[PDB]
Design a protein around this ligand. Structure first.
Ligand SMILES: [Zn+2]
Lengths: 380, 171, 610, 45, 45, 330
DNA sequence: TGGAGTACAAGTGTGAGGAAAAGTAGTTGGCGGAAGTAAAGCAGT
């Protein structure tokens, strides 16, 4: 199992450096994390050792090799890279080993293909086990680059950049030793800390309480009510960027929450690019004459006049360009009904943020309450 | 996928050229109060070429060449295990007509049989035959001869002539 | 008459095709396929508002909580006036309170005084029967069902000088036998769980169970759904469950099972079309429009369309559309779990010739899911149709006229507490940024007026002098303390670290700082080829990273400059993980940890095989 | 490269071991052997 | 495991699963008491 | 919302229907002796009923000799409370062996109550989770008359490993309704009836999952729906393309000696020949005694259609169409 | 002024729940009488 789980770990990292412009030393950082993982396997008595490994584990040790390298990449940009089938997380067994696959058992070859994506903070708790078997604390810089986190969260919903520094002063006021949202470790037990001990999880709750307070307690008559009706109407809106369509994939994969049957609200052109993404699912995922004959009668392309050779100048616009329409939509800038529409913006930025971090609302209703009733405790 | 097997395949394979025989039954228990109808596969019987049941029936000399046959393929034979046998025609007695043969092999049969007799060969509408010979004894006695299973039975004739319809002895 | 029936059954399902053709050589579409021809038919809502007021399961005994019909009273019998449209629904605290006219759309009346008559039990079923066209009039009596009792009401003599709805009632019949009744129909005629009875419905409200009855009780149909309707007025009833349809003539002694629905489907709904012959059925997986037989009225099975959804809580409502040549039937399947409708169109013609057209679906309001949808007869190729809905977790009955041509209170009930003590304690930090932003809107404005001057070039020449000293103190400590076999900050300065904002001048500093360390013991990460994770595209230069962020906050900002000039600095003063030890560090530690494992795991610790 | 020929669709076909003797475009069982470039000699008589 | 259970079927033991009474004092969890079989016998035959 | 073509199995649903039909056996066999006085637990359950295999429901026509007097002896609470006690006291032991959700599901369905949560709604396998999206998007865009997009969905849907005969042939109007660069529709129906036309006896003993007969199987005594649709679609196309002898020889090759619908179309194939051959465009030796075969075939194949089971033809008008073909002959 | 306690929130013990590829089983289809001329010992009345 370890010979193939490393072999798939190799194919994930080799994807990152070759395509996503990662530096070559990222593999070198990742091996020490992988090798000390093997020493924990080594320490256990070989008879009935039961090493704990899961496709969530090859993400967790990839995340620690990227936050020791102190990158702005996260599980927001890991669950988007695996649900869109970019790095070999889903059906990794079906394509990669090709000789070890036959000898591997029925349970070990089912643990390698990632049939169900990490949910309800499953990916955070595997980092907690990973920071407990090997000490990512006291050896590596367990310092989340929280400045590269919120800049994505600023440009995610097209808010003014004042909130980037409205947030950090709230973070700096309610924090341990001002800076250092330190990444947690759990060598303890099968008990999942409900303290929101995860450092990445803490920044989101600070971002929630910031965007409430800066608009609710506005004596300065700076953020008007009709600006919210030009933002909540603007954010609840569908576009065809590769971040938006890729976010639509992650809405599809998670069944538990609502806004999972959101494909009824799709449009014409947003459906076609989903089907062009479908030519990146089959390539991961004696009576062959029957299917060969049917694939002739249903050729996978369009019957004629396809969109490959001579299509356009542009159809799809990118993530730098839709914000140029979003910030050009909320152009005006200069109470019972005010606090009603502040509940229309807050539940929508909350819902769009659960789908990117794979946690439930009860995983986040706790994370607000452990932050809110620790922050007013500063004054009393 | 089911496909049509042409007799050129059965020559290469050195197998028979068999069409499937289907035979639906009837299971009427108690005078047809509960009928059960089951079509049953009864093996593959071999099939004469260029018949109704061969795949070369209404087929051009061009298309016989495209299916690996002679362009003037004749038909009329069976392919059994690659060997290409056929049923020999026979000469039999003319149907439904009473012949009046005399034969020395009739006195061999019983005492007081003459050489005389009337032999008829009756065929049913399903081409199955039956021979009824009508012997002459030296007593004025005339007998009716037939072979049922492989045996041979000898009933007197006015037993039949009084059994067929309601007759007087002047009719 | 077509050709393809079975006699026992009859199909026209989803897009295989029909199964019939006459070959009528008449130059007039020489085929009578059971699919008629037309163009498309898309349906648009016209929204109105009419009135207002365990969790993984639902109870099948509840049927409806609202009702509406053009109703005719005894005042309309005697006087020439005719046509009064009403509504009767259940609302209140427990939903035990029971209670008009269409002006141009269906709106509540001027007097807005609903006859909120009271029952001391929550209401489970509100229904009117509707009347046969062979009775002359429209009936004015509404039967209701509670958890505890059974009442009958009667609408009596609404006015025109006040438009008030005064009613009568019947003595409520309680549970003599104690089992929950399910469905009544009139056409007190009830069906309890497993067993039914014919009710003697009285005229007198100034002051019963008849002695002929029966049962259908199946020991293994575990659900609690039963249903009864009179079949074509011949004193013949149909008794349902989710497993069979039982026709009973209670005039004679005669009972026959027609549907048997155990193997691959179950019965969901059965709404009696007022067409007394053609009456619709809804199973799962199929919509059946099985009518009444012409000669012997027992049960006919007519053209049925299969149903591609599959669910456990499906219901249907049917509205006739009477037209000259034919009669249309729109059939609305809905469910309590989702908002979507699914409608199909059948056309009854004169000689019991049904057809089918296609299939369509519409959406609804984004809060709630329908539990009751009810049509309006509208007193009687651009089809129009009108109906009114009642959702789950919402008591707002809207009104929709389909024509052919998301806040949650859990987010609301969290914040804004009722503590006047901490009413300004939260605002003490809100007032803190009233001081600190004005502190920082001018502290950066000090750097705005300094533009390519030498006093700030002195700060970066000193910065290029103070970077190298504390680094080289640290670079040798990793060499003096090397043999540990067991980190990159660039923030060790403390003077201000905030007193220079000019990025192309600042870009040559860190490139000189890369030039300053060409030998070993220190390696550096990239910046122009790695900052693309914020913009998801090509990033050629760090100096034009600002270009697409300057053009990202032109309009929405006061002065639009000094906010973006310091976020770019906050990235580079956070992405400055630049003190990685060189090639001497990883190679010795990859092989020393492999020494700590046995030769069992040497082959299992090996990269680079393809 | 050793090849055979299908008796039905006449497609050339290399047939390794642990393969069923079938064509791989159609499914035809009978399968005839082609001839390769090999020397044989004759007298022209 | 099922290679072992098939050997006892010639003997005639009714190899069935365990009980919750036969779960606590045998080191196996109470929920996963289906894959854990206990083979007894019947005294007449 | 719509049905998915997935053979989805899960242990918790394999329990709760094995848990259900086990209890159904005891509460029936309890009623099987209290009505007298006055082995998988599911397969044993289906040895009581006959699966229809022609329809979803086994319909029985009522104006017949299936008549029965009413059992007026109704079932009250006094009898119902005792007939379920000794099953539930015999059912209480495996309720602790199932899960806590199954143990609460069974107590819910003991008294009515219908599940509000679908067995397909939490598959979460990322492959099936895309099938559920791609089928609900399939039926939605078929419904919106959006054919060039629904063709792209169904082309990608048949290539995911695990899809079935359900979505396959039913919505193959997308080829026939397209007519831009179509495969004519009819060639896909020929594909279906080449590899799914079985002659197996319908065994009816095994519990069936993921195939359900009346629209996707093809056993004996049930000609498959894609088989008879291939007959009618290749006859309407055969008329619109004015090859009639190809189909009339093609239908000649199976004798379906069970049903009546293929005999009527085999009658109707000759009736369309007798229509077209009886034009004669005069203003006369073989063209007369050719048609008199086709008139004779229709009068026999319709007669043998009536010899078989229920398929009610207008056997009066069709005789009156042949008489009009002889008035053209005279 | 003091202690009651009742809550709130933290900490420790313990097996039940969702998953998939192989295998098994479960039931059918399907295959290998117009012949002559002559003697002889054996029967018959
Ligand atoms: Zn071939």
């Amino acid at each position: 199992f370890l010979k193939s789980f490393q072999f798939i770990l190799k194919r994930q990292i080799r994807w990152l450096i070759t395509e996503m412009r990662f530096p070559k030393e990222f593999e070198h950082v990742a091996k020490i994390i992988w090798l000390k993982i093997l020493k924990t396997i080594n320490d256990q008595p070989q008879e009935e050792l039961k090493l704990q490994l899961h496709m969530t584990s090859t993400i967790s040790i990839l995340y620690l090799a990227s936050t020791h390298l102190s990158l702005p990449v996260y599980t927001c940009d890991y669950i988007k890279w695996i649900c869109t089938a970019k790095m070999p997380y889903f059906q990794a067994s079906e394509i990669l080993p090709k000789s070890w696959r036959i000898q591997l058992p029925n349970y070990y070859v089912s643990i390698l293909e990632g049939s169900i994506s990490p949910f309800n903070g499953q990916l955070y708790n595997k980092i907690a086990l990973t920071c407990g078997m090997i000490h990512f604390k006291e050896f590596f810089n367990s310092e989340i680059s929280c400045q590269g986190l919120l800049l994505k969260l600023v440009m995610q919903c097209a808010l003014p950049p004042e909130f980037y520094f409205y947030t950090k002063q709230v973070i700096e006021f309610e924090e341990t030793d001002i800076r250092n949202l330190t990444l947690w470790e759990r060598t303890d037990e099968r008990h999942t800390g409900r303290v929101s001990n995860h450092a990445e999880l803490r920044v989101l709750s600070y971002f929630m309480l910031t965007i409430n307070w800066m608009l609710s307690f506005d004596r300065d008559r700076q953020y008007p009510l009709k600006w919210i009706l030009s933002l909540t109407e603007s954010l609840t809106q569908r576009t065809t960027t590769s971040e938006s369509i890729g976010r639509n994939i992650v809405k599809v994969v998670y069944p538990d929450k609502p806004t999972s049957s959101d494909y009824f609200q799709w449009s014409e052109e947003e459906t076609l690019e989903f089907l062009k993404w479908m030519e990146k699912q089959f390539l991961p995922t004696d009576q062959k004459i029957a299917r060969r004959k049917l694939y002739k009668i249903f050729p996978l392309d369009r019957e004629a006049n396809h969109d490959g050779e001579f299509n356009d100048s542009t159809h799809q616009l990118t993530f730098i360009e839709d914000l140029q329409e979003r910030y050009a939509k909320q152009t005006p800038f200069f109470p019972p009904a005010r606090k009603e529409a502040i509940g229309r913006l807050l539940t929508h930025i909350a819902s769009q943020l659960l789908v990117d971090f794979a946690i439930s609302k009860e995983q986040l209703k706790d994370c607000i309450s452990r932050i809110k009733n620790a922050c007013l405790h500063r004054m009393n | 996928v089911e496909r049509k097997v042409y007799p050129s395949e059965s020559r290469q394979r050195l197998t028979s050229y068999r069409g499937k025989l289907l035979l639906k039954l009837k299971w009427s228990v108690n005078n047809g109060e509960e009928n059960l109808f089951e079509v049953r596969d009864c093996g593959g019987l071999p099939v004469m070429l260029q018949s109704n049941r061969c795949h070369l029936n209404k087929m051009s000399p061009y298309e016989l060449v495209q299916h690996k046959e002679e362009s003037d393929e004749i038909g009329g034979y069976f392919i059994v295990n690659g060997i290409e046998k056929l049923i020999r025609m026979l000469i039999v007695q003319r149907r439904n007509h009473p012949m009046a043969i005399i034969r020395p092999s009739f006195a061999n049969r019983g005492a007081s049989y003459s050489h005389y007799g009337i032999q008829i060969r009756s065929v049913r509408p399903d081409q199955t035959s039956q021979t009824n010979v009508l012997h002459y004894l030296n007593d004025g006695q005339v007998t009716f001869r037939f072979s049922w299973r492989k045996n041979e039975y000898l009933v007197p004739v006015v037993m039949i002539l009084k059994a067929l319809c309601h007759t007087s002895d002047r009719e | 008459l077509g050709v393809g029936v079975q006699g026992a059954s009859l199909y026209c399902p989803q897009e295989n095709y029909t199964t019939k053709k006459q070959e009528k050589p008449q130059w007039l579409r020489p085929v009578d396929d059971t699919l008629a021809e037309d163009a498309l038919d898309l349906h648009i809502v016209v929204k109105s508002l009419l009135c207002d007021t365990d969790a993984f399961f639902w109870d099948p005994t509840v049927a409806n909580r609202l009702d509406s019909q053009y109703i005719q009273t005894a005042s309309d019998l005697r006087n020439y006036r005719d046509g009064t449209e009403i509504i009767a629904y259940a609302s209140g605290k427990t939903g035990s309170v029971l209670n008009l006219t269409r002006q141009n759309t269906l709106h509540l009346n001027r007097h807005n005084n609903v006859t909120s008559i009271e029952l001391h039990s929550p209401i489970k079923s509100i229904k009117i029967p509707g009347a046969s066209e062979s009775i002359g009039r429209r009936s004015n009596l509404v039967g209701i069902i509670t958890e505890n009792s059974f009442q009958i009401f009667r609408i009596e003599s609404v006015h025109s000088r006040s438009c008030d709805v005064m009613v009568s009632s019947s003595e409520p019949l309680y549970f003599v036998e104690i089992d929950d009744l399910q469905v009544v129909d009139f056409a007190a005629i009830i069906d309890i769980k497993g067993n039914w009875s014919i009710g003697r419905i009285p005229k007198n409200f100034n002051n019963l169970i008849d002695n002929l009855h029966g049962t259908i009780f199946d020991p293994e149909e575990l659900s609690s759904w039963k249903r009864i309707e009179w079949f074509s007025h011949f004193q013949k009833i149909l008794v349902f469950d989710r497993s069979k349809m039982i026709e009973i003539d209670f005039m004679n002694n005669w009972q026959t099972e027609v549907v048997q629905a155990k193997a691959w489907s179950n019965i969901r709904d059965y709404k009696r079309i007022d067409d007394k012959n053609g009456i619709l059925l809804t199973s799962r997986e199929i919509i059946i429009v099985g009518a009444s037989e012409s000669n012997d009225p027992v049960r006919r099975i007519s053209w049925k369309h299969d149903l591609d959804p599959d669910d456990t809580t499906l219901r249907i409502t049917v509205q006739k559309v009477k037209k000259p040549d034919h009669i249309l039937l729109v059939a609305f399947v809905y469910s309590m779990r989702h908002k979507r409708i699914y409608m199909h169109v059948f056309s009854h013609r004169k000689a019991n010739l049904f057809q089918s057209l296609g299939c369509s679906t519409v959406l609804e309001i984004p809060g709630g899911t329908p539990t009751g949808i009810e049509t309006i007869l509208t007193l009687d190729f651009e089809l129009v149709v009108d109906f009114l809905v009642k959702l789950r977790n919402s008591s707002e009955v809207y009104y929709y006229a389909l024509s052919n041509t998301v806040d949650h209170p859990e987010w609301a009930s969290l914040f804004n507490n009722a503590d006047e003590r901490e009413k300004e304690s939260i605002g003490a930090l809100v007032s803190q940024i009233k001081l600190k932003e004005r502190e920082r809107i001018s502290r950066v404005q000090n750097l705005i007026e300094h533009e390519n001057s030498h006093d700030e070039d002195k700060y970066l020449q000193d910065l290029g002098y103070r970077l190298s000293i504390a680094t080289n103190e640290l670079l040798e400590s990793w060499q003096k303390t090397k043999d540990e076999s067991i980190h990159s900050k660039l923030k060790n300065l403390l003077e201000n670290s905030d007193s220079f904002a000019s990025i192309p001048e600042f870009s040559s500093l860190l490139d000189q700082f890369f030039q300053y360390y060409q030998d070993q013991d220190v390696t550096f990460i990239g910046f122009e080829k790695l900052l693309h994770l914020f913009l998801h595209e090509d990033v050629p230069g760090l100096d034009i990273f600002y270009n697409k962020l300057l053009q990202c906050w032109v309009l929405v900002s006061p002065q639009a400059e000094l906010l973006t000039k310091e976020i770019v600095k906050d990235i580079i003063w956070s992405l400055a993980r630049l003190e990685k030890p060189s090639l001497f560090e990883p190679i010795q530690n990859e092989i020393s940890r492999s020494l700590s494992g046995p030769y069992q795991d040497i082959i299992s610790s090996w990269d680079m095989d393809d | 490269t050793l090849k055979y020929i299908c008796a039905e669709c006449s497609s050339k076909l290399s047939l390794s071991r642990t393969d069923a003797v079938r064509c791989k475009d159609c499914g035809h069982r009978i399968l005839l052997k082609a001839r390769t470039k090999r020397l044989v000699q004759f007298e022209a008589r | 495991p099922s290679k072992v259970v098939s050997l006892f079927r010639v003997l005639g033991a009714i190899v069935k699963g365990a009980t919750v009474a036969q779960a606590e004092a045998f080191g196996i969890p109470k929920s996963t008491a289906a894959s854990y079989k206990i083979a007894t016998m019947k005294v007449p035959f | 919302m719509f049905e998915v073509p997935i053979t989805l199995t899960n242990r918790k649903f394999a329990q709760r229907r094995k848990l259900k039909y086990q209890y159904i056996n005891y509460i029936s066999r309890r009623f099987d002796r209290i009505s007298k006085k006055s082995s998988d637990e599911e397969r044993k359950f289906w040895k009581k009923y006959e699966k229809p295999e022609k329809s979803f429901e086994i319909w029985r026509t009522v104006s017949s000799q299936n008549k029965q007097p009413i059992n007026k002896q109704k079932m009250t609470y006094h009898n119902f409370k005792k007939i379920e006690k000794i099953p539930l006291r015999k059912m209480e032991i495996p309720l602790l062996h199932c899960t806590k959700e199954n143990k609460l599901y069974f107590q819910s369905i003991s008294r009515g109550l219908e599940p509000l949560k679908t067995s397909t709604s939490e598959v979460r396998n990322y492959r099936t989770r895309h099938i559920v999206t791609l089928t609900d998007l399939l039926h939605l865009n078929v419904s919106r008359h959006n054919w060039s997009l629904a063709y792209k969905i169904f082309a990608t849907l048949i290539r995911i490993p695990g899809v079935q005969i359900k979505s396959l042939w039913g919505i193959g109007v997308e080829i026939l309704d397209n007519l831009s660069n179509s495969s004519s529709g009819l060639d896909f129906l020929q594909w279906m009836c080449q590899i799914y036309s079985s002659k197996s006896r319908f065994v009816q003993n095994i519990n069936y999952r993921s195939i359900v007969p009346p629209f996707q199987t093809g056993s004996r005594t049930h000609t498959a729906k894609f088989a008879i649709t291939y007959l009618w679609s290749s006859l309407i196309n055969c008329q619109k393309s004015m090859l009639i002898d190809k189909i009339s020889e093609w239908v000649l090759t199976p004798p379906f000696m069970e049903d009546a619908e293929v005999w009527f179309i085999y009658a109707s194939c000759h009736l369309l020949k007798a229509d077209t051959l009886s034009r004669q465009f005069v203003n006369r030796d073989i063209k007369i005694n050719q048609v008199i075969k086709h008139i004779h075939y229709v009068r026999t194949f319709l007669k043998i259609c009536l010899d078989k089971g229920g398929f009610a033809v207008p056997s009066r008008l069709i005789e009156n169409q042949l008489k009009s073909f002889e008035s053209r002959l005279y």
